[PDB]
Write an enzyme that holds these catalytic residues in place. Structure first.
Site: not given
Ligand SMILES: [Br-]
Length: 293
Positions: A36, A106-107, A130, A270
């Site tokens: 995201n 991330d996701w 990350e 990030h």
């Molecule tokens: Br998120």
């Protein structure tokens, strides 16, 4: 920092929705998964480093990048579970084979870790950066963005994301050290230019983050896959970032206990791909060459 996408989009109909992906090259699959509020575009300056090392695949999550939007959209849509149903079906359809190297952020890391845990025989290696690797408390979360993420995880989240596009316009650039060019930024904006439900995925995702025990189903998922990652002799590549964002402090110490793991460190917050793509690319290539060797 190249501005063009790495490949042109290809499409498959999955479960009633057209999903977009990049697929270039031949051989064993190297599958890059964004989170995201990004898309396959995030990997555009990294994938070139893997040329000639395999078939390079980068999918756009449902509702994101060039993939279709769910309709009707609303607060019950784009949960982890629904994102998973669509992505896992796409990966199945693409006939990736059984020597997959996953490259995750991330996701994309929750999804890819879950997928590997459920397809252990098919995964040769995982590179991650990350990433979501353990249930969190707010103390683990970057101080600068606590308030914004608490707001997303409340009824204020709707105007924040759907009206004001805060994830794209504030969170994304705030977690890159350099300044994106306008052209790069407009590639990130593209999926979300329409106010309203087009921006739903950017809101549902933060609502799924496993923080202070909620949502319990996601906390449970992460605890399950992380127990596999602790114990497995599958080779890993941990790309640590400085200062970093979600893998810092105690979480970074935790990841460093995992076995059969190579580490690198690169500058970033990030969205580390936008600060250190050459270093990240080089490291993944060395990892994959070693696994082939
Ligand atoms: Br998120």
């Amino acid at each position: 920092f190249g501005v063009e996408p790495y490949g042109q989009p290809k499409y498959l109909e999955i479960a009633g929705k057209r999903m977009a992906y990049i697929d270039e090259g031949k051989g064993d699959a190297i599958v890059f998964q964004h989170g995201n509020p990004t898309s396959s575009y995030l990997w555009r300056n990294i994938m070139p480093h893997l040329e000639g090392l395999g078939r390079l695949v980068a999918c756009d999550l449902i509702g994101m990048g060039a993939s279709d939007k769910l309709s009707p959209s609303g607060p019950d849509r784009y949960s982890y579970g629904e994102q998973r149903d669509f992505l896992f079906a796409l990966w199945d359809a693409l006939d990736l084979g059984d020597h997959v190297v996953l490259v995750l952020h991330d996701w994309g890391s929750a999804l890819g870790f879950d997928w590997a845990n459920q397809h252990r025989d098919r995964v040769q290696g995982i590179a991650f950066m990350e990433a979501i690797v353990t249930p969190m408390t707010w103390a683990d979360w970057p101080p600068a963005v606590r308030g914004v993420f608490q707001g997303f995880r409340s009824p204020q989240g709707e105007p924040m994301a759907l009206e004001h596009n805060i994830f794209v316009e504030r969170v994304l650039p705030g977690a890159i050290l350099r300044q994106l060019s306008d052209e790069e930024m407009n590639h990130y904006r593209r999926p979300f230019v329409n106010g309203g439900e087009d921006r739903r995925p950017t809101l549902s995702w933060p609502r799924n983050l496993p923080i202070d025990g909620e949502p319990a189903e996601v906390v449970a998922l992460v605890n399950e896959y992380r127990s596999w990652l602790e114990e497995t002799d599958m080779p890993k590549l941990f790309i640590n970032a400085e200062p970093g964002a979600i893998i810092t402090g105690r979480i970074r110490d935790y990841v460093r206990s995992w076995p059969n793991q190579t580490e690198i460190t690169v500058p970033g917050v990030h969205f580390v791909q936008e600060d250190s793509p050459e270093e990240i690319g080089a490291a993944i290539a060395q990892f994959v060459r070693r696994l082939r060797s």
